[PDB]
Design a protein around this ligand. Sequence first.
Ligand SMILES: C[C@@H](Oc1ccc2[nH]nc(/C=C/c3cnn(CCO)c3)c2c1)c1c(Cl)cncc1Cl
Length: 266
Amino acid sequence: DLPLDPLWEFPRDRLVLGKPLGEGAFGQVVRAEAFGMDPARPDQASTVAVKMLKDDKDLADLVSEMEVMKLIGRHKNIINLLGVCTQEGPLYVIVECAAKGNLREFLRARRPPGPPLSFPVLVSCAYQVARGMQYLESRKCIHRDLAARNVLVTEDNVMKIADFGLLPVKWMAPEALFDRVYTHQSDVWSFGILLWEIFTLGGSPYPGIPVEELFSLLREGHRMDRPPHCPPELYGLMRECWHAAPSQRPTFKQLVEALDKVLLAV
Ligand SMILES: C[C@@H](Oc1ccc2[nH]nc(/C=C/c3cnn(CCO)c3)c2c1)c1c(Cl)cncc1Cl
């Protein structure tokens, strides 16, 4: 419908859509080839992802997400906005393409037969996700859902948090699960769960426990055990994230600093 933004408007003519990528609630995402995305070289073709409506009240969320992405600006560890097609019919939101898919699938696809994903790589994944979450928090933005399937992997193993904005019960903090309140510290609880997903190479949280009585065990002070071959330093981080009192869990800065110290152990 309305405005035309000269910092972001990109012509349909140099966008040829490709094969779908997935989901997601807000609309289908499709691979696409864009021409001249870097106006330095207007030849330099590149692979981008395009978010569209399916065909709506989702038009409101789609425009809303686009405007949010403009506000936050770039960062290494989020899916960044590249341009928008508002001018000749259907809305297109062009964002960067993570070639290796989501992090849980990246992990599961390279699992041993039992007992590549060396220890620096997995620490590198956790460090990058912590850096992206700290940045989103610093822009007063947030991403409740945070789970390994919410994280995308580029061709060069850069982690990018998909979507952010200004049911998944095994990732939710107690106060969000029961009091329906969400803060940065409840993200830290979810990041702890994501940490466990990473060092189980894409495992399912609380294996075997159906999605009910989980809450009673959390009230008993129980939490998932240390996964195999996970060093005690990283399990310590996980359990600090799973402290019941929100102010006793670490902030994303402290998680950044602790993970960075683990990366430096080289
Ligand atoms: C619903 C979908 O949203 C997005 C949003 C922005 C994106 N930029 N780039 C990708 C690449 C997705 C992909 C899927 N598979 N592969 C390898 C093989 O094709 C690549 C992508 C996906 C999704 C999916 Cl598709 C997966 N996990 C999380 C989410 Cl949010």
